[PDB]
Amino acid sequence: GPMNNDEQLEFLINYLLDERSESIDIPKTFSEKRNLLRSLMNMRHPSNISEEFLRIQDEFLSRETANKNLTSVEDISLSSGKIMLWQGDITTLSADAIVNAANSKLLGCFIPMHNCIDNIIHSASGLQLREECNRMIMLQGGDEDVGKAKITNAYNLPSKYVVHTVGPSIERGMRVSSDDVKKLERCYNSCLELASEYKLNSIAFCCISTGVFNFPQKKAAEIAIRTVKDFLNSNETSLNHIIFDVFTDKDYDIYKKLLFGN
Ligand SMILES: Nc1ncnc2c1ncn2[C@@H]1O[C@H](COP(=O)(O)OP(=O)(O)OC[C@@H](O)[C@@H](O)[C@@H](O)CO)[C@@H](O)[C@H]1O
Ligand SMILES: [Zn+2]
């Protein structure tokens, strides 16, 4: 019984629904079915699942990834030495490592359909990403501190690895402290160091802490660029491309000014 795309979606939804206590009339349209799969994956605490599920999940998500408009590193025109600036979706970029602005529990996002980068990454990667992270935290015996990095396989993403970092959060209407700056610096440093240790050719950062974490976007960009330039000026590294993956026009305009205003 080889399965077509729709049968794979049905199988995945039904497997996860059978695990849940709640009853949900199965949706009809493609948006409703796909969004249900993502919701159920989002909510699923780590627990053993069938080799069959994971096989089918991988086929489905891998096929979804292949059918996106993907970007290779060599496709990116806008570079300043090893630094690249690129606006787009990090789940469609075939960098060796992408950086996830993760939470301190590191299991991804359990809020269904939440468009934080953590949810988006886990949703495209597969449930193995949450599982790998669960193991790491279990063994660590504790929540992940801000300003660190853990690397995992990227699974069904077009990248090879996900580097998970937890950034500083700025409370509504409060200024950034020196400690806040040092924490964000540390996230950039820790990701660059880990990807360098793993002998990677490329890493793509998201704009850490500038979404829901309210880090002022000019200030964050200045830190990110300074930390990356200091790192390249001070270290031998396998890294040949450090990609600033921006998601908003506002971030693009900021990074463009800072990198190419010269
Ligand atoms: N597909 C995409 N590709 C590239 N960039 C994307 C993206 N989707 C969103 N972004 C951008 O990712 C950055 C981090 O935002 P986010 O709001 O995801 O992240 P942060 O502001 O760093 O806040 C951290 C929280 O999300 C975190 O602690 C947890 O609670 C998670 O569960 C912002 O610049 C977003 O616009
Ligand atoms: Zn979220």
Author numbering: -1 to 260
Show sentences the authors wrote:
In some pathogenic microbes, the response to oxidative stress is controlled by a SirTM/zinc-containing macrodomain (Zn-Macro) pair responsible for establishment and removal of the modification, respectively. Strikingly, however, the “catalytic loop” found in all other MacroD-type enzymes (also termed “loop 1”) is replaced with and extended loop containing the zinc-coordinating Cx(4)HxC motif, here termed the Zn-loop. In all structures, the Zn2+ ion is tetrahedrally coordinated with three metal-coordination residues within the Zn-loop, while the fourth coordination-contact is exchangeable and is provided by either ADPr, a water molecule, or a symmetry-related protomer within the crystal.
Interestingly, the major difference between the SpyMacro and MorMacro complex with ADPr is the form of the distal ribose. The linear ribose isomer is usually disfavored in solution but has been observed in the Getah virus macrodomain. The open form is further stabilized via new contacts with Ala100 as well as the short 19SES21 stretch in a symmetry-related molecule.
